[PDB]
Amino acid sequence: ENPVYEKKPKREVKKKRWNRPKMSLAQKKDRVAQKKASFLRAQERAA
RNA sequence: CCACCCCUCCCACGGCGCGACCGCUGGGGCGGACUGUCCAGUGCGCCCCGGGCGGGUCGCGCCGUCGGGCCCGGGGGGCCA
Numbered sequence: 001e002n003p004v005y006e007k008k009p010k011r012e013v014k015k016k017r018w019n020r021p022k023m024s025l026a027q028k029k030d031r032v033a034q035k036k037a038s039f040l041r042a043q044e045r046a047a
Numbered sequence: 048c049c050a051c052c053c054c055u056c057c058c059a060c061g062g063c064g065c066g067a068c069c070g071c072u073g074g075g076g077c078g079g080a081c082u083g084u085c086c087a088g089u090g091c092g093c094c095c096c097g098g099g100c101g102g103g104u105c106g107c108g109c110c111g112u113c114g115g116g117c118c119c120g121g122g123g124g125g126c127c128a
Contacts, residue, residue, distance in 0.1 A: 034083035
């Protein structure tokens with residue numbers, strides 16, 4: 001009788017990011033700086 | 048028409064210090080993610096700037112030059128005029 005497809009109307013999206021963004025070079029380069037500081041004050045406090 | 052004496056036009060090229068324009072670019076603040084075996088650190092989206100730098104566009108001031116304009120225009124020597 002009526003095979004034609006009435007589409008579902010695209011509601012206004014508030015646009016929030018459920019996905020985690022890609023970690024930038026500055027952050028990645030700085031983490032390994034913080035880690036190699038954290039390791040050397042885990043010796044200076046220790047020894 | 049040119050050598051002589053001031054001034055004046057646009058165009059060309061080079062220099063120079065200035066305006067008005069896309070990038071680049073430390074710090075002040077919203078907003079959110081994120082990191083570190085101390086509370087401390089790092090991008091990020093709207094904007095704000097304290098700045099400088101050239102790229103070229105665009106528009107100036109002034110200087111350069113046996114400059115180009117039938118050597119623009121106005122106050123003795125050579126022209127297949």
